[PDB]
Amino acid sequence: KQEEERSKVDDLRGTPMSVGTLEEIIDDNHAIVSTSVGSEHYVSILSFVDKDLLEPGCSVLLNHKVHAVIGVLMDDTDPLVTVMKVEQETYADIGGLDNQIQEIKESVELPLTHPEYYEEMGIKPPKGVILYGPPGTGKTLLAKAVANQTSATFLRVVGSELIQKYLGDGPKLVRELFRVAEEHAPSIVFIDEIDAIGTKRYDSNSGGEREIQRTMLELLNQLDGFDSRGDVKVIMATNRIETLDPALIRPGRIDRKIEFPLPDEKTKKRIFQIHTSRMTLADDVTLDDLIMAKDDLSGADIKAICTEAGLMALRERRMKVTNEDFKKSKENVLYKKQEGTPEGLYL
Amino acid sequence: RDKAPVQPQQSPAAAPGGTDEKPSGKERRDAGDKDKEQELSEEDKQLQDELYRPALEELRRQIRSSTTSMTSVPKPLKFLRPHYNKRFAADIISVLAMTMSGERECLKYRLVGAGEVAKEWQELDDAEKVQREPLLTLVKEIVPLLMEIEQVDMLEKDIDENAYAKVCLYLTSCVNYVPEPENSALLRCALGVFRKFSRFPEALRLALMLNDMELVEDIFTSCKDVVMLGRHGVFLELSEDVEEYEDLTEIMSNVNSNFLALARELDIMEPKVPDDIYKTHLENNRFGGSGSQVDSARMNLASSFVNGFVNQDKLLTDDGNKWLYKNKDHGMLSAAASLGMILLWDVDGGLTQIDKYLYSSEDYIKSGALLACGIVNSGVRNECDPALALLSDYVLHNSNTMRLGSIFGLGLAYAGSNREDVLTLLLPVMGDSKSSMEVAGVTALACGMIAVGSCNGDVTSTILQTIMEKSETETYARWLPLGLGLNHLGKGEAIEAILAALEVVSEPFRSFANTLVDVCAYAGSGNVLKVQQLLHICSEHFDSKEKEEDKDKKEKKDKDKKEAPADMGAHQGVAVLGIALIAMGEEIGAEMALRTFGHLLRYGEPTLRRAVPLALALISVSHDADPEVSYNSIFAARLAAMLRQLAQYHAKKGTLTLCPYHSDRQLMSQVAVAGLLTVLVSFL
Amino acid sequence: REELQLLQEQGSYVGEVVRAMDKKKVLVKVHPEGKFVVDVDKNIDINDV
Ligand SMILES: Nc1ncnc2c1ncn2[C@@H]1O[C@H](COP(=O)(O)OP(=O)(O)OP(O)(O)=S)[C@@H](O)[C@H]1O
């Protein structure tokens, strides 16, 4: 019966079930496998259990004695599903770009959700935008707020999440996440800090000249090359502009680009009231003095400064926060800051 | 300061000493103590001691609620009867009394069932009214009606906060987290406090759920007291079930002569179609694009159906002739009724357009013409008469197909409280039970749709005779349970499932009927017992009861649909992949609908690849034609082109839209079954 | 001292295990090799891994 069929399928299997990546679709009941060291014979492939479901370059079950194709690999999962396969919205504290929000909207949601305009005005959707600037000003923050502000299930993909030194694990995660983006849904595969090709290295990593080079080749051929977009929103924002390979600076790969200054007085007071709200404010302290002195508050000093000001105060268990506590909080946060002459020597 | 002077005051049992330390305890109780009250194991020895032993119990409950307990903490308080908005008042009221009286009330609500607990509950409710804090006080005082009196004792000034937040979150957790019975008292007290309030839509959804005829009279006399009004009748008809519209129209016909015009018919549709021609502007090249699909007389059939459902005019109505002559018998049923689809308005125009196909040369022409006459409107009840007399044939005559059409059109048109004349004529419809499945199909369907939304259904003799005559001869056993469960609809606590298990259980046909009755008894609330029942009985060997039994999901758990995705596709009973396909349905089509459709689109069976476009294009009413072109590339037999045209159609709790797709859920049959497919009128 | 004939054949090494699974199987990181689902013993339960 069926139990006997399963017992026979197990009879075909050798107790030590090695693992070998398929090389090519050759269906004369034998394939050309590649185990952890690349055992590539014309080993038989079990016919009844699906022999042709898995593609070439995919892990399958292998024998030990003859390394025969034992079967399709088990359901494997990458360590990023919880971040990518997603189970703050527009703005919980309006007071920042107040515009790049709208622009990433028009560049991602409007194209993706209603792509009935690119034939309405002979146009093409933005296949890629880059957003960059200081180490935290409103680049990835907007993307995080855009994840909730969308009619689609966004995906979070840390640029370093794709750094696994296993053989082809780079291309493996490319394949997995892209089979997601294409055969899960029209998703929002957001990948940040993707500028990691320029001027550093790792200890938990081998020679990148020949380890992640073909990995990036696979990733590029996947995203904006072959098996092209269609409607697969995978936009690549950054922080820098320089250290990158111009193989993608050319359009097509990515079309638009956006930067991020640091917020202005109008937005300084905004994010102040956003953060200074977390404490019973001693209103005699002058936010505007902090705003003009710290006139280049990317967005970390504001948060850190107000949190540490609350800490300074509530160390004394006071409700109000005198100005000196704010001074100490900021100056601890704000090291190495000398904005006087120059200049410094004028008006 | 140091406890060295103030700690040893607990060793003596002096009455003046205790009674001058315990008020000092109240004074130092602003921060509790110098610390987290480590004076416990040195004061627990004083439990046996007995002037101000009320203050002694105050100190005792303070320190015990300061460390931990569940029952020994509130005893001193209920033994205290607290006597004798500050930070110390914050301490011993807000957080302390919250946790304290909360565990006390939970223990007394799960253990016994005195008045002292209601006293504490009222006192803390007034205290939190002074605190003005909802969303934790309300949700904690939910489980102790106590709720009704708390509402009518709190609802005086705060209108927005209480009503919006409390009512919405509690109704959400009442269809999601709370069971049904207490939601009835919720409904009653909300009805009261909203009769005290404005913004009638709250009472209108209170009626949408309660299914009440007093609420509709009150909201009508008040919405005449509060003079938009046309739009108000429009979405009153859009919100009302089938039971309350006839009761409301007759209780009005008893007593401005315009609420009769609005909330029965002919006024929800009077402003719509003109403004559709005005502000909506569809082009004519879609008629062609969807119509330029090469003629196949069955692909041409589906294309005629699609372009019949375009709605900027009735172009397809008057598109010459020979399109219906090209069609065949059941295709002629669909196309002669297609003219009613393009004309679901114009009461007078409906007759002046269909009388040319009424009583005409072809039997299918006249039957589908009566079908369209029933389709076009639901308030004229004058097109019923010319058919009602004919319907009787007793075996296999023209008026049997005309009876299919007109019985369905009258179940659609008029669905009163209990309309018996159509039932006295349906008794000869089921008593005949012509070999065509559609006869008994529409018999049960009309009986249900006029009996849906009933007061917990009914155990009346009609569906009982129907069960008898169905068990007499074993799609009949599939679509007669359709009407059975439809008559079961409107239930909140009906015992119909038990009587059906008593009379019906048999070989898996009537066992499937029993599980149909079960599916139509638990529309959805918090009753996860039946959910684990379904989880286990899904492993039943019968691969057919699985279908509807798991398809009940999209009804049971529709509100917080985030858990609706299950492992149905990961299951291997391919009918269960179709189950999930149904479970997606026709709503706004979230990205998770597309998540299912990503794989459910690419399928090979001409039945489930035929079941997926229905749900996909019905859930999305470039972006949308993308699965259309996807199927165009997927297939390029005839079923593939037919499902493609079905999707082309679909592209361009009300019971009105609850039955038809479950009726269609037996799609694996002939196009004669698809001959009655043109009855799914559920969109505006 | 007689027992020591066991000490002539195999000081079985530590094979890493990504995780457990049913069918009496796991995802063993064969430390100086790849991952290859292999057999188990009949002593501990599947969840134990
Ligand atoms: N709407 C907003 N516009 C601009 N800034 C905001 C906004 N909302 C919050 N912020 C602040 O901006 C910061 C966002 O920093 P992020 O860009 O998320 O940091 P990051 O992405 O880790 O930066 P790097 O380059 O990876 S170190 C937060 O710390 C917020 O305080």
Coordinates of C-alpha atoms and ligand atoms in Angstrom, one line a residue, chain A residues 93 95-97 134-141 193 239 275 298-300 303, ligand 1:
Chain A
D93 CA 5.9 62.9 16.1
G95 CA 8.9 67.2 12.7
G96 CA 11.5 66.0 10.2
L97 CA 11.8 65.6 6.4
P134 CA 24.5 61.5 8.1
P135 CA 24.4 58.4 10.5
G136 CA 20.7 58.9 11.3
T137 CA 18.8 62.0 10.0
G138 CA 15.7 60.6 8.3
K139 CA 17.0 58.0 5.7
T140 CA 16.1 54.6 7.2
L141 CA 13.7 56.3 9.7
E193 CA 23.1 50.4 4.7
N239 CA 24.3 56.9 4.1
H275 CA 11.3 64.3 22.7
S298 CA 21.1 64.9 12.9
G299 CA 18.4 63.2 15.2
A300 CA 20.4 61.1 17.7
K303 CA 16.7 61.7 21.4
Ligands
LIG1 N1 10.0 61.8 10.9 C1 11.3 61.9 11.2 N2 12.1 62.6 10.4 C2 13.4 62.7 10.6 N3 14.0 62.1 11.7 C3 13.2 61.4 12.5 C4 11.9 61.3 12.3 N4 11.3 60.5 13.3 C5 12.3 60.2 14.1 N5 13.5 60.7 13.7 C6 14.8 60.6 14.3 O1 15.8 60.1 13.4 C7 16.5 59.0 13.8 C8 16.4 57.9 12.8 O2 17.7 57.3 12.7 P1 18.0 56.1 11.7 O3 18.3 56.6 10.3 O4 16.9 55.1 11.9 O5 19.4 55.4 12.2 P2 20.2 54.3 11.4 O6 19.3 53.9 10.2 O7 20.7 53.3 12.3 O8 21.4 55.2 10.9 P3 22.8 54.4 10.4 O9 23.4 55.1 9.2 O10 22.4 52.9 10.0 S1 24.1 54.4 11.8 C9 15.8 58.5 15.1 O11 16.8 58.4 16.1 C10 14.7 59.6 15.4 O12 15.0 60.2 16.7

